[PDB]
Design an enzyme around this catalytic site. Sequence first.
Site, mmCIF file in Angstrom:
data_model
loop_
_atom_site.group_PDB
_atom_site.id
_atom_site.type_symbol
_atom_site.label_atom_id
_atom_site.label_comp_id
_atom_site.label_asym_id
_atom_site.label_seq_id
_atom_site.Cartn_x
_atom_site.Cartn_y
_atom_site.Cartn_z
ATOM 1 N N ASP A 21 0.860 -1.217 0.000
ATOM 2 C CA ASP A 21 0.000 0.000 0.000
ATOM 3 C C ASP A 21 0.883 1.250 0.000
ATOM 4 O OD1 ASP A 21 -2.183 -1.484 -0.054
ATOM 5 O OD2 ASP A 21 -2.939 -0.971 1.897
ATOM 6 N N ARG A 35 -0.246 6.262 -1.007
ATOM 7 C CA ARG A 35 -0.928 5.160 -0.274
ATOM 8 C C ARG A 35 -2.191 4.744 -1.029
ATOM 9 N NH1 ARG A 35 -2.871 6.488 5.432
ATOM 10 N NH2 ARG A 35 -3.952 4.608 6.071
ATOM 11 N N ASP A 40 -6.241 -2.092 1.497
ATOM 12 C CA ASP A 40 -5.611 -2.486 2.789
ATOM 13 C C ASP A 40 -4.739 -3.725 2.573
ATOM 14 O OD1 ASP A 40 -5.861 -0.951 5.014
ATOM 15 O OD2 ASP A 40 -7.942 -1.437 5.289
ATOM 16 N N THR A 41 -3.525 -3.699 3.049
ATOM 17 C CA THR A 41 -2.628 -4.875 2.871
ATOM 18 C C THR A 41 -2.376 -5.532 4.230
ATOM 19 O OG1 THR A 41 -1.030 -3.081 2.673
ATOM 20 C CG2 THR A 41 -1.373 -4.483 0.743
ATOM 21 N N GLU A 43 -0.246 -7.470 7.222
ATOM 22 C CA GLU A 43 1.109 -7.223 7.792
ATOM 23 C C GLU A 43 1.992 -8.451 7.561
ATOM 24 O OE1 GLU A 43 -1.070 -5.339 8.333
ATOM 25 O OE2 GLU A 43 -0.915 -4.114 10.099
ATOM 26 N N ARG A 87 0.937 11.057 3.110
ATOM 27 C CA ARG A 87 0.765 9.969 2.106
ATOM 28 C C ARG A 87 -0.088 10.483 0.945
ATOM 29 N NH1 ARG A 87 4.963 7.797 4.820
ATOM 30 N NH2 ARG A 87 3.924 5.933 5.564
#
Length: 149
Positions: A21, A35, A40-41, A43, A87
Amino acid sequence: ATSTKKLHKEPATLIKAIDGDTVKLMYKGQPMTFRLLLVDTPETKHPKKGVEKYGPEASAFTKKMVENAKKIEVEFDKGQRTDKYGRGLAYIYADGKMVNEALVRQGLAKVAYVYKPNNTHEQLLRKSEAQAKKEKLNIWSEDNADSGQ
């Protein structure tokens, strides 16, 4: 819808990607972070025994799609332009392909929380997310049999 569209895309180059992201790109003749909006990525540091699910996947597809995509265009949404950490809140387009719609339609990223006014390519991200879940891609591949029992 409109006569010739009301949104355009500016030309940008690749600088240095970090996560799935977070990607640095050269825009306006300056190094600015970007961003993925509405994205959403997962972890990849939570686990110390190495990620066995999908750690090094969205990051590899982000540097591979950005390093190969010679035509990288960016499109800021009518919403804000920079988050609180500096971002670049916008959408990326590798080879005319919505980078965000790619990581989501691939089953490697989920639509990030939706907060107005940022909600242009929202319904579109909902269709791609349903397709990945309808194909059981990566994370959506959890069904084992579900045939009766």
